[PDB]
Design a protein around this nucleic acid. Structure first.
Length: 174
RNA sequence: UAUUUAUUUU
């Protein structure tokens, strides 16, 4: 039984295509095959693919170089996409109302207790990006996050500003 | 005004 070769390359340049994606990695080693999370119902497209090598060595060795490829638009990163954690997919969460000294681990330990999170962090830059002050939690199970949110998110009435707000990604400027 | 914008796929 195999699966470990299921290397997932997340944050793919929407403007790029499957051929180039494969072509790009082509100059790395013996790429038995590749994959892409493409839908056949709505046809929206998320933005992450996969690389299936023959052996783990060239699979991990490649990671060393593809685990942080920054482009003019965005960054590309390959990871060991687990076979299946029983209904995983996008469990990304939005949590606003955090201070400048917001500790990622604190948020991680906070939401981790609610459910084993895949990736939890806060967006707040002042040199490379921009000043925001919001946190996010990428859980394994959406329902866990949804329920967590239900038992985590507060409220934002007129007689207030931001009394803790943790919810699912709504939309930035679209 | 919310993450590298979307780490889980004929």
């Amino acid at each position: 039984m195999d699966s470990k070769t299921n290397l997932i390359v997340n944050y793919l340049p929407q403007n790029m295509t499957q051929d180039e994606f494969k072509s790009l990695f082509g100059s790395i080693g013996d790429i038995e095959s590749c994959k892409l999370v493409r839908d056949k119902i709505t046809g929206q497209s998320l933005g992450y693919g996969f690389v299936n090598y023959s052996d783990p060595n060239d699979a991990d060795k490649a990671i060393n170089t593809l685990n942080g490829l920054k482009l003019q638009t965005k960054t590309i990163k390959v990871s060991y996409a687990r076979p299946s954690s029983a209904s995983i997919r996008d469990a990304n969460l939005y949590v606003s109302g955090l201070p400048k000294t917001m500790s990622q681990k604190e948020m991680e330990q906070l939401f981790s207790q609610y459910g084993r999170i895949i990736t939890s962090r806060i967006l707040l830059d002042q040199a490379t990006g921009v000043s925001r002050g919001v946190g996010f939690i990428r859980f394994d199970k959406r329902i866990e996050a949804e329920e967590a949110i239900k038992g985590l998110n507060g409220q934002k009435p007129l007689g207030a500003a931001e009394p803790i707000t943790v919810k699912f990604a709504n939309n930035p400027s679209q």
